[PDB]
């Protein structure tokens, strides 16, 4: 959830801890990334086909 990442970044700011500003933003951008979303979606599809196979095998 992007809301979680966003809230954590703000709570850290409030404490005076900015050691994770960049890390969180990068994590954030990756999760929102078109390439990342295409890869996730496709891997889940391949995962389902493999599960269908395993099922077939008794």
């Amino acid at each position: 959830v992007l809301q979680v990442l966003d809230r954590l970044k703000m709570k850290l700011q409030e404490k005076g801890d900015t050691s994770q500003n960049e890390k969180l933003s990068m994590f954030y951008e990756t999760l929102k990334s078109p390439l990342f979303n295409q890869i996730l979606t496709l891997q889940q599809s391949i995962k389902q086909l493999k599960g269908q196979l395993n099922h077939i095998l008794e």
Partner: protein, 51 residues
């Protein structure tokens, strides 16, 4: 061990050991689970290896 996974996992553990309020503890716990998930990791590694 994937250095990118570990770098992100470490960052999350730092947050967990810093923010002590209840919501933050629950939020971070969820993010640690996500980062620990094999499906997330497979997509994460592949994404990074291509960029």
């Amino acid at each position: 061990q994937d250095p990118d996974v570990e770098d992100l996992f470490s960052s999350l553990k730092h947050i967990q050991h810093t923010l002590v309020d209840s919501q933050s503890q629950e939020d971070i716990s969820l993010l640690l689970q996500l980062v620990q998930n094999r499906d997330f990791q497979n997509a994460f590694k592949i994404h990074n290896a291509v960029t």
